[PDB]
């Protein structure tokens, strides 16, 4: 790969290496050389520990820039369009093996982002919108949490029955958790009044009369409905002819 | 079948016929003859309209008695054991074609009873016990209602969901109806408190702490239960290793 006479090799975060000249040149700057994805990057630095900025040009004229932090604890690898300013990809890697990788839309704005923690768990963001929202996924050991992203926080949601658990992660990385239980409305209870004089059972639900069941001198049962206000009967009484029709009227 | 010289034939309820002599005998009583189920029954009456009591003896010595009401509106056909007093069957039939038929246990007590109304609907009682209870069935046009019998009333029951409809019929035949709705208890609602200092969500149900969910600095979730009183934690925290275990803890 990269070769430099009278150089020291420096190991970098992200499984990269930079060669730094043992000697400084006329300006007292040190030469830096690195090969990243088979492209040679080069720069000069005031320092000789391996920190600085290295640059190169892909065969398709894309511009590549590798920035190495002063203490060697972090690398930033950026790929631009040929203009040298519209980002195509960006990966920041720290010595503890955590990292942030971004993909960009055609205008150079972040459209996807993967945060890899030092322990290998990940936050994966896709479909990022200009207001900072998007779809979110937290990849943990043994399982994946799903949710959404806003500008201030990532909200991962687990649902079971009527219970919702929300794990919120601020851009700072602070965690806060909430739980909600929204039980369905209790079904309104049927009550009934019996008028022995008219052999009529009047059912009520939610304080409204719903129907009259008449138990006739002919040993039959009829059902008649009330209007939506429960004010008076509507239509005509219907004689029940099968058991399922009694059950239905009790629904 | 039955034959009598100088007699008039009288049609009776229950598709029976009695022959009555045109003349009274020395005592001024009239001869009555009838054939019921191929057995000739005979009696004498003070009256000549066909009312009275006729009796006969089956080939197995069972005693049969047919009583015809004074106005001919009702017949009672009883079959006894040879003692002439332990009932084996009894059928009362009215001119309007309603009827009551009873079967009896070996001690001559009613064990089953069918009431047939003039309109052909029926009440069917089986397994009648000495306290007057038993199983009940009302056979209506198009469907059958099921229930139970007590000494004072027959209670036919239709259930749908949590609703129970009861049709009560007194021994007099008066009808009264009731409805009950017993909704299940509303599921107790989960609530939770978040302690940011300990990154711990504490769930409560029915005013008792149920479990702690800890969201650790290692990007893991642990769950630990409280005792049945909700007083303090029990056992040891268990690390969640799959999504189903989070859902389970939310059940």
CB contact under 8 A, A160 and B213: no
Q: A68 and A18 in contact (C-beta within 8 Å)?
A: yes
Angle at B177 between CA B173 and CA B181, to 5 degrees: 155
Nearest to B246 among A119, A141, A165 (CB): A165
The first and second tokens of residue A14, run together, are 């992200």
- Separation of alpha carbons A36 and A53, rounded Å: 13
Say if CB A8 and CB A19 are below 8 A apart: yes
Longest alpha-carbon distance in chain A? 120
DSSP three-state, residue B166: strand
Tokens of B210: 């149920």
Distances in Å between the Cα of B137 and the Cα atoms of A149, A226, A239, B3 are 64, 31, 20, 42
A166's CB contacts (< 8 A; 6+ apart) are A147, A155, A156, A157, A177, A178, A179, A180
CB-CB contact of B25 with B42 (8 Å): no
Residue to test with chain A: of B116, B121, B140, most A Cβ within 10 A: B140
To 5 degrees, how large is the angle CA A183–CA A184–CA A188? 125
Cβ atoms of residues A82 and A62 within 8 Å: yes
Separation CA B190–CA B220 (nearest Å): 22
The Cα-based distances of B158 to A146, B135, B229, B237 in angstroms read 47, 15, 41, 50
Q: Are A103 and A110 in contact (CB under 8 A)?
A: yes
Residue of chain A minimizing CA distance to B180: A191
What's the CA angle centered on B52, arms B46 and B53, to 5 degrees? 125
Find out whether A233 and A212 touch, Cβ atoms under 8 Å: yes
CA neighbor of B73 nearest in space, from B56, B46, B98: B98
In which element (H, E) is residue B246 found?
Answer: helix B243-249
State the alpha helices, DSSP H only, in chain B: 243-249
* Residue A192 to residue B178, Cβ atoms within 8 A: yes
Does residue B139 sit in helix, strand or coil? strand
Task: Check if the beta carbon of residue B90 is closer than 8 Å to that of residue B102.
Answer: yes
Q: Do residue A163 and residue B190 have CB atoms under 8 angstroms apart?
A: yes
CB B77 within 8 A of CB B36: yes
* Of the partner residues A119, A163, A199, the one whose CB lies closest to the CB of residue B250: A163
* Pick from B141, B177, B186: CB nearest A201: B177
Instruction: Output the six-digit token pair for B208.
Output: 């008792």
Distance from the Cα of residue B18 to its chain's centroid: 37
Q: How does DSSP assign A127-191, residue by residue?
A: S--TTS-EEEEEE-SS-EEEEEE-SSEEEEEEEETTEEEEEEEETT--EEEEEEE-PPPPPPPEE
Contact flag A158-B186 (C-beta cutoff 8 Å)? no
Which method was used? X-ray
Are A219 and B142 a contacting pair at CB < 8 A?
no
Asked whether the beta carbons of residue B219 and residue A140 sit closer than 8 angstroms, the reply is yes
What's the gap in Å between the CA of A43 and the closest CA on chain B?
Answer: 39
Would you say B128 and B102 are in contact if contact means Cβ atoms under 8 Å apart? Answer: no
What sign does the CA torsion over A36, A38, A39, A41 have?
Answer: positive
Q: Where are the alpha helices (DSSP H) in chain A?
A: 243-249
A27: its two tokens: 């300006």
* Contact predicate B210/B191, CB 8 Å: no
Residue among A181, A210, A217 with most chain B CBs within 10 A, to mutate: A181
Residue of B165, B203, B219 lying closest to A119 (CB–CB): B219
Q: Which residues of A touch B158 (CB under 8 A)?
A: 243, 246-247, 250
Task: Please name the member of B158, B189, B219 whose beta carbon is closest to the beta carbon of A247.
Answer: B158
| A46 burial level (CB within 10 Å; 0-12, 13-18, 19+) | exposed
Instruction: Collapse the DSSP code of A213 into the 3-class scheme (helix H, G, I; strand E, B; otherwise coil) and give the result.
Output: strand
Residues 6+ apart with CB under 8 A from B189: A181, A183, B205
Which among A28, A21, A27, A25 has a CA at the least distance from the CA of A6?
A: A21
State the resolution, in angstroms: 2.0
- 């056909």: which residue's tokens? B77
Query: How far is A36 from A58, CA to CA, in rounded Å?
Result: 11
């Amino acid at each position: 790969g990269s070769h430099m006479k009278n150089s020291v090799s420096v190991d970098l975060p992200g499984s990269m290496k930079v060669l730094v000249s043992k000697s400084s040149n006329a300006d007292g700057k040190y030469d830096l050389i690195a090969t990243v994805d088979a492209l040679e990057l080069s720069g000069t630095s005031d320092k000789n520990n391996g920190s600085g900025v290295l640059e190169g040009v892909k065969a398709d004229a894309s511009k590549v820039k590798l920035t190495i932090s002063d203490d060697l604890g972090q690398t930033t690898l950026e790929v631009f369009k040929s203009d040298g300013s519209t980002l195509v990809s960006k990966k920041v890697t720290s010595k503890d093996k955590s990292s942030t990788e971004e993909k960009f839309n055609e205008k150079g704005e972040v459209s996807e982002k993967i945060i890899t923690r030092a322990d290998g768990t990940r936050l994966e963001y896709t479909g990022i919108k200009s207001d900072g929202s998007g779809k979110a996924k937290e990849v943990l050991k043994g399982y994946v949490l799903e949710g959404t992203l806003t500008a201030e926080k990532t909200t991962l949601v687990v649902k079971e029955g009527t219970v919702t658990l929300s794990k919120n992660i601020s851009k700072s990385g602070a965690v806060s958790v909430e739980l909600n239980d929204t039980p369905p409305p209790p079904p309104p209870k049927k009550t009934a009044a019996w008028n022995s004089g008219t052999s009529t059972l009047t059912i009520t639900v939610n304080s409204k009369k719903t129907k009259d069941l008449v138990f006739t001198s002919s040993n039959t049962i009829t059902v008649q409905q009330y209007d939506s206000n429960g004010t008076s009967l509507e239509g005509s009484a219907v004689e029940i002819t099968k058991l399922d029709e009694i059950k239905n009227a009790l629904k």
